[PDB]
Symmetry: C3
Subunit: 38 residues, 3 copies
């Protein structure tokens, strides 16, 4: 309801945040490369 | 074995580590910018 | 509705993902430094 389902909801929310950070790591990685060959 | 309070505690712990990694991404982003602009 | 073993399993999987991201942040950090003190 509002407790074990709360845990499950929050874990999914954190998975999304994980995924957003992987995408941001990749953006920053491309920014470093442009600096590197520029 | 499966302690629900333990699960909730560990989810909160991982949320704080998420938060710290966001701040570290931000630190690295500014360092990249320092090298882009100089 | 919620499978508690599954929740524990997924929390540990997300923990491993966090640990890998920490290591990836560190790799990118070294790359930036390489550009910086070059
Ligand atoms: Na920033
Ligand atoms: Na930002
Ligand atoms: Na920002
Ligand atoms: Na710039
Ligand atoms: Na070290
Ligand atoms: Zn622990
Ligand atoms: Zn099951
Ligand atoms: Zn899984
Ligand atoms: Zn460092």
């Amino acid at each position: 309801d509002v407790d074990i389902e709360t845990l499950k909801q929050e874990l999914l929310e954190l998975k999304q945040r994980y995924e957003a950070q992987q995408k941001a790591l990749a953006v920053l990685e491309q920014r470093v490369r442009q600096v590197e060959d520029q």
